Design a protein around this ligand. Structure first.
Ligand SMILES: Cn1cc(C(=O)NCCN2CCCC2)ccc1=O
Length: 103
């Protein structure tokens, strides 16, 4: 319904955001040491993309839960002053403000 039409706007705008590069694809645990043991429920934009296209979101609140999970995992694994962590705060602050402009 009208809830999930804006989830497409935010996800599209989040995908094309400049600071979205750490979260476009799922984290590769073979390449990132310690990520498999620290992050229980990983989540990224592409995973939210394929679920949203298939329709697996019942309400907008599920979409926000996956989005906040991306930045929670980013803050949990990475330092705040790291290159991945710096982009996470930019993407997180962009989402919470853009999510505010509708709800
Ligand atoms: C979300 N996240 C991402 C990384 C990462 O190193 N991403 C590199 C992504 N590749 C660089 C250019 C092509 C894709 C590390 C920790 C983390 O939590």
């Amino acid at each position: 319904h009208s809830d999930l039409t804006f989830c497409e706007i935010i996800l599209m705008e989040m995908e094309s955001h400049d600071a979205a590069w750490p979260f476009l694809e799922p984290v590769n645990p073979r390449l990132v040491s310690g990520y498999r043991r620290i992050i229980k429920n990983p989540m990224d934009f592409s995973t939210m993309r394929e679920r949203l296209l298939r329709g697996g979101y019942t309400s907008s609140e599920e979409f926000a839960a996956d989005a906040l999970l991306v930045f929670d995992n980013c803050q949990t694994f990475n330092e705040d002053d790291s290159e991945v962590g710096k982009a996470g705060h930019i993407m997180r602050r962009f989402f919470e403000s853009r999510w505010e402009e509708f709800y």
